[PDB]
Subunit: 152 residues, 12 copies
């Protein structure tokens, strides 16, 4: 039982809804001397990945699929993980979580680029490549914030 382009895209709809909720979690709960800069930065990421999510869902529609569209479906299909905010985290801890999710998305998107190349879906292939370009840039910048190299 293989995963085709429709199944991959729907999986990323689920992932991206979990991810945007996580971005809001960080936005709301962060504390520390870098608050103002990172508080705004989370708004930027929230918009960007919400747009990605919409575009993925509507590409899935355009190839004849049916996107997940309830919280229950997102939780049942996402590989991105979430956790309630119970005890105080440092800013560095929150950014480590963010970067970890960005790396997860990068690697899964690479799987989807290979898949859509194989299946001959050139539109979806280039869409995913553009998304990955942005993700790679974000990983460099947030790793730099943490004092690390991009692929470290």
């Amino acid at each position: 039982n293989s995963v085709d382009t429709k199944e991959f895209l729907n999986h990323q709809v689920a992932n991206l809804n979990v991810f945007t909720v996580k971005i809001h979690q960080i936005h709301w709960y962060m504390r520390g001397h870098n608050f103002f800069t990172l508080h705004e930065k989370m708004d930027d990421l929230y918009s960007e990945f919400g747009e990605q999510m919409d575009e993925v869902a509507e590409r899935l529609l355009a190839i004849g699929g049916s996107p997940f569209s309830t919280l229950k479906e997102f939780l049942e299909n996402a590989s991105v993980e979430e956790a309630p905010y119970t005890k105080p985290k440092t800013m560095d801890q929150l950014m480590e979580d963010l970067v970890g999710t960005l790396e997860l998305l990068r690697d899964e998107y690479k799987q989807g680029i290979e898949l859509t190349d194989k299946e001959g879906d050139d539109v979806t292939n280039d869409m995913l490549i553009a998304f990955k370009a942005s993700i790679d840039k974000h990983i460099w910048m947030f790793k730099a914030f943490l004092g690390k190299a991009p692929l470290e």
Copy 2:
């Protein structure tokens, strides 16, 4: 007993379920009114997402801790959701939307009364502004369905 913090957190959950429902309608709608209502759902997605952020951050400002996971939202919301399995007419989708707007209207009225009793003037006026917008939306979408606002 439900206090101001608990009410606001309940609405964080509700509003997250609701914006996802708005996207469901946006994506799955069909029919002659597609282009108009397709765009309208984007307008609503933005407005109620903003409401959600403002509610969560008012909760923070009074010393609370907003729900912030899909699991919590589903565990706590009173807004209902369902997977899109069978085709729905545009009228059916707008009836779902209107029903959820009416639910939020009535719950916001309960929260206005609660915050008025407790003396939280800021939260009270925030909820009042939200309800003003919701009431206008109910009038307009009921009009689309050929009905009066309170019918």
Copy 3:
């Protein structure tokens, strides 16, 4: 015996009479302050037309039916109008404007009391916002006339 719906509809009529008066002043004014006050009347025309629309649509949203003909506006308004037949000074025109602003202020105060008593919080806060703007205008136009706001 006057409820919130009847009050709001009364102000629909008042505000239509008032905007026509603002245009009368806009067109017929003369004197050294012409250019500034000519533009100012456009600002007021827009603001109070917006007020009128918001009032009518709030009346709709609470289940009412706004007056929507000149015949109804004349039949129901408490704002007064008179044809421009003989020359008036700029001060006389602004005294008429300020007198009408004072009428609207006091009637809006009655409606704030009414809606606070009947429990319509959305309409109540709407009227309070309008009154804030009207009070500022009264200060400024009294200042133009060389007077304190409440004299």
Copy 4:
């Protein structure tokens, strides 16, 4: 009618005030599947014909006249008709009322174009011509909405 340029312009001040109030009536009371589009559309018309009304009144001032400026005067003088909204009307009925008033204004403006041509008031003549150009376009579009040819 037995009307010179000043009397014609003042007549249109009265008409246009009745018309803008009618546009608001339709804006407020309309119902049906076409609500959102036409609801906004009537804001467009309200702005345009209020601007026309101001321009007509101020051209009347500029040629030495005195515009009507009370509701009593508008009602006593307008040929545009109004009626209270008492029983439900379909969207098609509301647009038929709108179109009927647009046709009335078109034909009266044509009378004014001829009159101002004869009297030698070239400014007023060209002003009315521009207004009629817009009215004619509106008539085509709203008849099309109703499924009819522009002059049917």
Copy 5:
């Protein structure tokens, strides 16, 4: 020896250059309690009538003519009059001069509208009508500033 369309347009090039210089004179030398409003208003008129002047000159070019283009030519052909500012004038006096020049331009433009109608130059005719529309509005407003009716 009749005046044709080319000669009329060139005459108005001269007039409008004299007029814009007069507007600057008023802008610079005015005093009194209405200074700020009228100081800015003169900038508005300066731009508007400079644009009129450019459009007149380039319409003259487009019909095969050659516009005056030196101060000497403007002074030798304009009917608009100018005078050095030697003794203090009141604001009302300056606006009376402005209105007088506006009325001169209105009446000459009316002559040109008749002329171009007769000669069959429809473009120039409608250009002049549009200009006259604006002039008539200005005359109403500035007469109102002076406490007078537009045609008084």
Copy 6:
């Protein structure tokens, strides 16, 4: 013989041929004035496409039916076209452009007279405005060519 509707439709055809010609010049031009005139052709393309739309919709508004296929445009246009096979200098391209502008000027003059006679004041003033712009373009492009506007 030719009435207002037939005249306007003839110009719909002409203007479609003309905008395609403007694109030909835009694409194939070479020489030291490339960048300026390349952009200039974009300006004309927008302007005369807008003219074409306005003419077609005026024709609709007076009860007519605009041509709306390439076959009809070629069948009715008096503007001439030629495939780009041998290289043309910038001056040859601009002389073709100017020649077509002069054709449109003269035909628009005929339509101005016709609509004047028929009493169609709206169409008359529309064509006059168009001709004003065309005359300005003729002056400027003739100047580019080192010539007087009517030479």
Copy 7:
């Protein structure tokens, strides 16, 4: 047989036929969805005119010569046109639009494969971007028609 230059030129022809068709629909449409779809056709006209310009200029940049007359467009296009004689419903007009979008999708797919084979990476990615937009349009207009995107 067909190389990249010939493919691109074929699409210059197609896109000119298509934009003229979009104007036909813009002008002749009637029905309750008039205002929304009238504006929508303006959006498509701009988008596919831009596509046409980009294709023609890519053809220039790889050493080719774009078609640039109505005669050539009609001689080479596979997009079909018909004069508007009998009245068409809004659904018929939208089905014609959608049919042409599907033609362009399938032909663009052939060009994507061809340019991939020939090693023209720029042209390949250009056509992919165009096809992304076309696929979205097909989904939305099929939805307007009450159909699934590939039905």
Copy 8:
């Protein structure tokens, strides 16, 4: 013995002292967060200058006379100021800022109660809106300091 007019005038004084303090912090701050917080102080300077103007002009509109000299501000303010004599850390400057924000919050709460008791609905809602913003700022600057809003 403090009425609405006296409360508002007290806040005119407080807000002038506060904006000058904001400039002190803007000018003298040092440390790694310099650029971000330097800009942030401009934002606060604008917001609370706007508040000061609105308070003074509301005082005018109810018949009062705002303090309008540095001497009056100093004689009446409850907000404290001190010359910058020795270097302070960014955290110390932000703790001073937050302390003044908390002072303004608590005094506004008193003014909301007072104006509610006296029946000044406009002034009451103005103070509520201001307090909403102040509470949000307290949450954000406390977060910067590593603390909960009410800690």
Copy 9:
């Protein structure tokens, strides 16, 4: 015994007193020129607040420490202030404004000379630019008062 740092700090004090005076005039003015001059005072408030900030930050950049409390401003300013106790005419308020502008002009002339003598080229040119603006304002406000600039 006054150097560049002391001169600049003296002007920080002067400019804070001045902007508060501008607000006094803005708030308390009455008469026929109310609307125009009311807005004009906002313009001056912004310009001279900007000057004050630039002066303080230039003082920082040359190693100085700007006054940053109302007490310091009052202890050091040469600009005068007085409480608004009895009504003043618009002409009296503008005469006060002009008097302060002339004071600032003359002191700046001294500062231009001082900084030229001390070799501070940046500060010298900053003061020259400010004085250019002040001189223009003196001409305009004197004109409002019916006087020549130096009368």
Copy 10:
């Protein structure tokens, strides 16, 4: 002897002659560079008109009285003008423009020296800024003519 007021008035006259010359070039130019230089003359007309207004109003601010009639401008200007009688090449027109720019440059240098001697720091720096722009223009228009700036 020429003092600062006399110098500035001389430049009011010069600049009025110059802007009229710029329009002459704008209107009468022909040749291949028409569109570029036609627009460029509008840019110059605006810039030197602004210079003229600033010079006249600086003269007002120092107690002077600017020339304000065509007769005065012609009586006092050193910039020369001539009617356009015979065709001029674009190069000839730009040589006239450049010659006038060089005249203004040299006269402005004399005025910079004069105002430096007299101690008018504001006027001095104003003239310096003007000369900076003039020098840049001379470089660019000399480059157009194929020459170095000072050749």
Copy 11:
């Protein structure tokens, strides 16, 4: 050359810094009838290729590389050539230098498109493709300025 994706990108950082300085040389030293148009045009190119340079350097960072960041490194590594402006050049000669460098960058970018395709770096591949699209358009337009076909 014997070059992987990181080395290719760094080579283009060096090239693009040499190129932007060349664009300024042309901007500053050009003379002739086409001065104003091409003077502005080079500002356009300076912005575009400086942006390209930044994007290339930051993609290099995002894949774990280290961009050259000194003039010494740029000179030691670039294949784009530069020469001091000593004797006068015609506008055509300057544009021939510009076009020659654009052709060099086009061909090297093509090498990088092939290389990144082979190595599986899809993001970098598509980035380079977009850049080459722009370069090819520029080559057509500047050859047209010179009176030549794009590939002549």
Copy 12:
């Protein structure tokens, strides 16, 4: 023995080395202040590229010939560069930035002295304006490092 032309050309070289250094810092910086300072370096890159262009074009306008190759910039600059080979802290990078700003400040002071002595008033005021900005930057970046501006 160094005149104005030689000084300006020296600063052309310096400013090109400096902008490349700004990009080095932009690309290689790491640490908690990354996002703010990353953007800040773009601001500086633009500003000092603009400075460089203005200096080169002023040199042209006074008859000079700017350096325009990397080889010339390296041969002539006094600003230092070093490859980024081992990790540096944000403080170290900003200390390098500030050191270069101080070099440019002091050299610009030398050029201000030089041009004031040689009588080039335009270049003199240009350099003074640049120095004003540089001095402000020195204050702000020293503040970031926790230091006073001139330590």
